[PDB]
RNA sequence: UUUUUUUUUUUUUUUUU
RNA sequence: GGUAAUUCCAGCUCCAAUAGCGUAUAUUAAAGUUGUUGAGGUUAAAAAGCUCGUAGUUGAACCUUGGGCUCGGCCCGUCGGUCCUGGGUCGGGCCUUUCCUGGAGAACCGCAUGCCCUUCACUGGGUGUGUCGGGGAACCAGGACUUUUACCGUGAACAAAUCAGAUCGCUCAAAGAAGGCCUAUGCUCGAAUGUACUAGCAUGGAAUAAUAGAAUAGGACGUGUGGUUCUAUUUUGUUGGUUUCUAGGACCGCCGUAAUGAUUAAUAGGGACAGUCGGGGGCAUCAGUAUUCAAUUGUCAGAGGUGAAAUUCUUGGAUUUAUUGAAGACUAACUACUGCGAAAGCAUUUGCCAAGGAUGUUUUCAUUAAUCAGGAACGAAAGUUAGGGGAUCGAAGACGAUCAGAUACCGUCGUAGUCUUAACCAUAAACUAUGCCGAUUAGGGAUCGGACGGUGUUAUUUUUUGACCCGUUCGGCACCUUACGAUAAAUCAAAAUGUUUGGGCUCCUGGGGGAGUAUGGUCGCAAGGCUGAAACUUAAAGAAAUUG
RNA sequence: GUCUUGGCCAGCCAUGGUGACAACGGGUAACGGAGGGUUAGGGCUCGACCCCGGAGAAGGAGCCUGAGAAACGGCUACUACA
């Protein structure tokens, strides 16, 4: 309910109150402040390219015991450094030091998904070749 | 009760309820005549007089105000108008 | 309830339905207005005038007896007080607190009441200026309160 | 502070109706209240209502027949266009053939169905069904 | 009404006349 | 998924969509998780510590109603005329105290004729009309008299394209505005219609919501009379050039006309008056034991303290006994499901100072009111500055115990503080975790203050008052049973009158953390207060009950 | 002075104008709109972009011709680039 005004000439109070209280809405606040353009590792884009700096292993969260294979990637467009998960069995062999890879979102809206702590991006393509294509017997990694 | 004729309540109820809460706020006060001892003059006094009323020319106190009701001086007869 | 207290107490006077003088009054409207003028000329406030007429002379309601309220009678006869009753008693009360507050400085309860008393004066004087009883430039000032009451 | 004497009358009416009482005392008296009562009485949703005269705002005693589901006011009195009656009726009434939305138009206090006949509109002030 | 600290990770249940 | 993997890698089989399918990001619905419709605030996040108060929002009732005469449209029935009927609704005029100039045409009163009629004047004519005359009317055009805003109805105007939507067999369809008919000669329908919120323009409606009107009458009214002043259509010629009456505008007299002019007094509010009521506030004052210390006093070995001890004091008489004095703090028992105060808070006596609610009222004013963004007063304890005081208790500190340790709980000391004057600070689980105003709704008994009525004891009394008893009522602190209701539940007479959802106002909350943190501002002597994020992280955190 | 009105500009005089109904300042990853998407109603969001209006031609300024330009597939000057 609430003690909202109910006069016939209280539209200004009703609009001002709604504008103030709408900031507490998490999704409106994210859009209104433009945090994707400001603080997101991407510039608000769906994908981004970067250079693989090294291969790191991430221990899975409880209850789960495994080493998730990941790579430290420095984005070309802005220089920010992120960690990208390498999906599928044995796909870490395709990725190597100083490769050019394309990253995408990993799940839902920048939040880490699954038992991988602190990893919020995934590798899509390596050297212009899809990771799934490399993982299957479909395409060949560039000769370089 | 689910069925009351509120238009015409009992006169006993009227004397029971508050002076404002009745159907029509009839005041519970009255005007009254004081006969002072030793003289034959009639002075009209409010039932709830807030002042020490003295008769016209007799130089005698007729009532003392206290607690929202005049207390007549002893030795005086009264008759409600 | 009360404007400056919790105070949800109902207590008033119930005017009778008659609107007509009762049969036991044999006084002329000319006589009672002469009584009103004599009392007001002495210095009685219109609130005080009604009390003495009702308690001693048996006038239940001056308006019922005559047709005009006491203040409108006084203004017509040119004996209305320069300052209204409501402000005069409120300003006189505020002056009383000042003389106590000057002597007693630790009385923070008296200090709080003075704010309430002053707030009623400002709200009241705002109403009088709206209807035209007081000049629009009339202002209640702390140190000038005693001068007005005298 | 009293702000809507119309709401006080209808709230008192509805409280007595839900309690099963066959009558209710209404204070104070207003032209809107009497006209609003007469709209009830024409459709039979109430019975006799009697106004007690006084040298102040009057009182009303309404005799209830028990065929009264809900009566309520609308605050504020929204300005309603002719195209807006159907939306107001749909969103506020039961099925659109029992209840009656009360408006105030230049023709006076009158029903939503009567507005469709007279092709007039105004301000919504109450309802019943 | 003397005092008595601690217990390594995960693992502990499903359908109808 | 830990050696029987329906979830990984594969083989087989099957399912969904299919020339498509998956993935990442943005946005919409779901989301009554942004709530105007339409959220939540006792415990899940959330009523500012409390009061005053400006802007804002909202604001008691009251002024032409009732009846009748009618006339017309539409709808609901039977009459179906060719293959006229009642009721309901809506609208129009009249009665019931309810615009002139020129009228070009209107029209009432009789009309030039005309119409019927009591036997009461005969008739064959004349459309458009002239005059006497014109209560009420559309017509043009000049002027006067209209309270003003909000609101609703209608109308005009209001690029295409888009959208909704009509038509046509692009082979259907998305589309497009085409096409169709006659054998031909050439003949023709189309290329519709709706949509203009809010602002602007014109008119009507007059309820609802506002505002003015006559009160020091400086008020209204003329075929009333008299002045001052200003202007000028016309006559014998003269907006140039003035010189009389006279026709209009302003102001001011005397007389008359008139029902001559002010709505209530809200179980709204303010003020006044009377007797009470209170541990409400300030100042000074008085008493009380107790604690500590000291003096005198008699005694001898222990006394304190603990679960048990020890530190500690003690033949210099400790502890204990009696008397007295000093100091400072405090106000026991009485003391309560009692009272006062806005809250924080407030308990010995007396005097003074100012204030307050309730009650009673046939006193007064008459809307003066409610809530409040910023703004302001007060605001426990702790803490700060400068003096005074410093009995007790006691942060810090020092020891003695316990313990593995014991920087603690326990015991002996003990500084700041605890008390007070002047000035700060402005926070509390500042809690009823429950904002303020208003109305209504089930019963009952206690209790406090006031008032009223009755009764009988008791003390006084030229029969009043106090105590006790019963009842009524107003206003409080609460409580007991119940659910016609509410909630998720515990529980609630409010947390009820809410999916049958709108009485007024203010404030706060939007999963858990990060975080009441960083930064900027402002207040403070400082401690800090107020305002107040984001990155990042996470699938729960949490509320009430249930069985173990 | 301008095609013309105008504090548009030059002289003289006065002290005003706006603001809590949010002026002024800041941000926009803001050209405005007709409109696109999605919605029972109430709404949310997007609109550089086939149409209408505005502005610009590496960044400012100035100007000729001309009815019409502060034009840039015109000129002049400065900065950067070449
Ligand atoms: Mg309103
Ligand atoms: Mg899990
Ligand atoms: Mg009240
Ligand atoms: Mg208030
Ligand atoms: Mg005020
Ligand atoms: Mg344990
Ligand atoms: Mg350990
Ligand atoms: Mg441990
Ligand atoms: Mg919610
Ligand atoms: Mg909690
Ligand atoms: Mg909470
Ligand atoms: Mg509170
Ligand atoms: Mg108002
Ligand atoms: Mg005292
Ligand atoms: Mg001794
Ligand atoms: Mg007491
Ligand atoms: Mg005592
Ligand atoms: Mg008093
Ligand atoms: Mg707090
Ligand atoms: Mg709280
Ligand atoms: Mg209430
Ligand atoms: Mg009681
Ligand atoms: Mg009593
Ligand atoms: Mg109480
Ligand atoms: Mg949320
Ligand atoms: Mg949160
Ligand atoms: Mg629990
Ligand atoms: Mg831009
Ligand atoms: Mg751009
Ligand atoms: Mg140029």
UniProtKB/TrEMBL annotation, chain C:
A GO BP entry: translation
One GO cellular component term noted in the UniProt record for this chain: nucleolus
Ribosomal protein found in the keyword field: yes
Domain annotation Small ribosomal subunit protein uS15 N-terminal: ranges: 1-59
UniProt KW keywords: Ribonucleoprotein, Ribosomal protein
CDD domains: Ribosomal_S15p_S13e (cd00353)
Pfam families, A to Z: Ribosomal_S13_N, Ribosomal_S15
Domain of life: Eukaryota
Family matches, as InterPro entries: Ribosomal_uS15 (IPR000589), Ribosomal_uS15_arc_euk (IPR023029), Ribosomal_uS15_N (IPR012606), uS15_NS1_RNA-bd_sf (IPR009068)
GO MF terms, alphabetically ordered: small ribosomal subunit rRNA binding; structural constituent of ribosome
Homology family: Belongs to the universal ribosomal protein uS15 family.
The name this protein goes by in its record: 40S ribosomal protein S13
């Amino acid at each position: 309910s609430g003690g909202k005004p109910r006069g016939l000439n209280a539209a200004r109070k009703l609009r001002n109150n709604r504008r103030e209280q709408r900031w507490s809405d998490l999704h409106y606040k994210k859009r209104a402040l433009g945090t994707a353009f400001k603080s997101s590792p991407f510039g608000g884009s769906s994908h981004a390219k970067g250079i693989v700096l090294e291969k790191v292993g991430v221990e899975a969260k409880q209850p789960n015991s495994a080493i998730r294979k990941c790579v430290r990637v420095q984005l070309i467009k802005n220089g920010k450094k992120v960690t990208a998960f390498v999906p599928n069995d044995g796909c870490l062999n395709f990725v190597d030091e100083n490769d050019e890879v394309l990253l995408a979102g990993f799940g839902r809206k920048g939040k880490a998904k699954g038992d991988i702590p602190g990893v919020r991006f995934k590798v899509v393509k390596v050297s212009g070749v899809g990771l799934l294509a490399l993982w299957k017997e479909k395409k060949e990694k560039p000769r370089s | 009760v689910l069925a009351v004729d509120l238009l015409n309540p009992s006169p006993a109820s009227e004397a029971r309820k508050h002076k404002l809460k009745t159907l029509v706020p009839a005041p519970r006060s009255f005007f009254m005549d004081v006969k002072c001892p030793g003289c034959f003059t009639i002075t009209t006094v409010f039932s709830h007089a807030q002042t020490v009323v003295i008769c016209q020319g007799c130089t005698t106190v007729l009532c003392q105000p206290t607690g929202g009701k005049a207390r007549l001086t002893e030795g005086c007869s009264f008759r409600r108008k | 309830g009360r404007m400056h207290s919790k105070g949800k107490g109902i207590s008033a006077s119930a005017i009778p339905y008659s609107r007509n003088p009762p049969s036991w009054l044999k006084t002329t409207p000319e006589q009672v207005v002469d009584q009103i003028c004599k009392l007001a000329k002495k210095g009685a406030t219109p609130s005080q005038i009604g009390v003495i007429l009702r308690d001693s002379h048996g006038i239940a309601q001056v308006k019922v007896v005559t047709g005009n309220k006491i203040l409108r009678i006084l203004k017509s006869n040119g004996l209305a007080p320069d300052l209204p009753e409501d402000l005069y008693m409120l300003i006189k009360k505020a002056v009383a607190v000042r003389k106590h507050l000057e002597r007693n400085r630790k009385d923070k309860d008296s200090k709080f009441r003075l704010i309430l008393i002053e707030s009623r004066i400002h709200r009241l004087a705002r109403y009088y200026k709206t209807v035209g009883v007081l000049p629009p430039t009339w202002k209640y000032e702390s140190s000038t309160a005693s001068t007005i009451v005298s | 502070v009293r702000t809507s004497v119309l709401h006080d009358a209808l709230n008192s009416i509805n409280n007595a109706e839900k309690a099963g009482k066959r009558q209710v005392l209404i204070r104070p008296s207003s032209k809107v209240i009497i006209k609003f009562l007469q709209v009830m009485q024409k459709h039979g949703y109430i019975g006799e209502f009697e106004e007690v005269d006084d040298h102040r705002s009057g009182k009303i005693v309404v005799q209830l027949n028990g065929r009264m589901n809900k009566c309520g006011v609308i605050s504020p009195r929204y300005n309603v266009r002719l195209a807006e009656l159907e939306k107001w009726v749909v969103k506020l009434l039961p099925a659109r053939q029992f209840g009656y939305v009360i408006l105030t138009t230049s023709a006076g206090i009158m029903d939503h169905e009567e507005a469709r006949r007279k092709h007039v509109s105004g301000k919504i002030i109450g309802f019943f069904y």
